Design a protein around this ligand. Sequence first.
Ligand SMILES: C[C@@H]1O[C@@H]1P(=O)(O)O
Ligand SMILES: C[C@@H]1O[C@@H]1P(=O)(O)O
Ligand SMILES: C[C@@H]1O[C@@H]1P(=O)(O)O
Ligand SMILES: C[C@@H]1O[C@@H]1P(=O)(O)O
Ligand SMILES: [K+]
Ligand SMILES: [K+]
Ligand SMILES: [Mn+2]
Ligand SMILES: [Mn+2]
Lengths: 134, 134
Amino acid sequence: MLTGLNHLTLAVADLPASIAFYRDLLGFRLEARWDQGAYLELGSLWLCLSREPQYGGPAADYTHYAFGIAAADFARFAAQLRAHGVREWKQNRSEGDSFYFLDPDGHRLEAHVGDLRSRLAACRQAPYAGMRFA
Amino acid sequence: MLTGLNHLTLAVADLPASIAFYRDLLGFRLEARWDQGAYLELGSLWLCLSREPQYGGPAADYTHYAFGIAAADFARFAAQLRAHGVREWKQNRSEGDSFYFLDPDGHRLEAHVGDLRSRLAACRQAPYAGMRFA
Ligand SMILES: C[C@@H]1O[C@@H]1P(=O)(O)O
Ligand SMILES: C[C@@H]1O[C@@H]1P(=O)(O)O
Ligand SMILES: C[C@@H]1O[C@@H]1P(=O)(O)O
Ligand SMILES: C[C@@H]1O[C@@H]1P(=O)(O)O
Ligand SMILES: [K+]
Ligand SMILES: [K+]
Ligand SMILES: [Mn+2]
Ligand SMILES: [Mn+2]
């Protein structure tokens, strides 16, 4: 069977800028760097940055990558990145604090308080349209 | 500060088709579905499918999502998805077996044997160009 998420790989046009963003601004640990990429870790997440100098960023769509944060740290994180001029791409509407921000290439990120279990519980108490649980 | 990956959200043009692909071909568990999305889980991975009917699939770039698989299971998985007519987008060149295939929208997926530690260990015996390690 498949076991989970093994790694997330992001195309990046400016590898140095993306390393700085994920490591220095977001707190990922840089584990390796080479002329065409970097490997970083956050908790159990393996992030690969693959250098693609002609990359123009993603299509405009809902695809996005959310990282967890503790409730007590949310407000400070959102304020830190806002003060650092990071661009937002969405305003939170769903259960649990969320800050929706763009990376240097325009990959859509989120910092979120909550998990699947808190989402399903909130949803059972107030179901989305047509919602069915399984 | 940030703790890891909280969830992966994919834009999907055809929500029923994507549910069946992730559940039935890739073995995710369907936890909830509503008119505009679904929540699934594989291991610790929270996958959200967000219905976006005019989505045309991603840009052609290196961005991709890899799921783990055990060495002994690899060949059967690759064979099964090929027999089912899944399209491939890349040929493996790096440490650990990998099968690189597209989802119904063209999101780039991978089934991979190994992890960050096995990659780092392999890279230290045979480093990529310019490679430096923490
Ligand atoms: C992605 C779908 O538009 C909705 P939401 O952002 O309000 O959940
Ligand atoms: C959890 C799923 O990504 C959606 P939301 O961030 O709009 O709640
Ligand atoms: C994504 C970069 O082209 C390289 P590789 O696929 O050989 O690692
Ligand atoms: C692990 C990083 O995604 C790259 P690869 O799949 O080309 O090895
Ligand atoms: K939210
Ligand atoms: K590989
Ligand atoms: Mn989200
Ligand atoms: Mn990969």
